[PDB]
DNA sequence: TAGAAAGTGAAAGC
DNA sequence: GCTTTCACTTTCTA
């Protein structure tokens, strides 16, 4: 309910994060959106959400005590989610992935 | 074109 | 149940 997996297929499910989305409803397939920090269009709001949530959600960001860290929620993500062993990523800018 | 700023997996950490 | 660190590897934009 509070884990990675159940916390993420939820957050898919509300398309309240833009690009996060399914694929396949029953083979259990989704995308997130994953544009380099270094890129033009880039910006905090609107690409790092669904990394600042985990981070929201864990403990890891409390908003207003502490500075910004998109690096850091990114990469707090991916090795949480590439540490569970019941998601798959599809190694076919995103990343797609598939919760067997 | 280039180095700085991102980003990465994997082992070590709590 | 993931987070941090580490020793490198990438993506940029101009």
């Known amino acids: 309910?509070?884990?990675l997996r159940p916390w993420l297929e939820?957050?898919?499910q509300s398309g309240r994060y833009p690009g996060v989305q399914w694929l396949?409803?029953?083979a259990r397939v989704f995308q997130i959106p994953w544009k380099h920090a270094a890129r033009h269009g880039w910006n905090i709001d609107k690409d790092a959400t669904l990394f600042r949530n985990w981070?929201?959600?864990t403990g890891r960001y409390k908003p207003g005590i502490?500075?910004?860290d998109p690096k850091?929620?990114?990469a707090n993500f991916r090795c949480a989610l590439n540490?569970?062993?019941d998601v798959k990523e599809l190694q076919d800018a995103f990343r797609v992935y598939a919760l067997l």
Do not use: F, G, M, V
Request: proline share 5%; net charge neutral; aromatic share 4%.
């Open 24 to 26: 396949d409803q029953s």
């Open 72 to 74: 850091t929620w990114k």
């Open 83 to 85: 540490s569970l062993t």
């Open 66 to 68: 502490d500075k910004p």
């Open 55 to 57: 981070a929201i959600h």
């Open 10 to 12: 939820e957050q898919i």
């Open 1 to 3: 309910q509070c884990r």
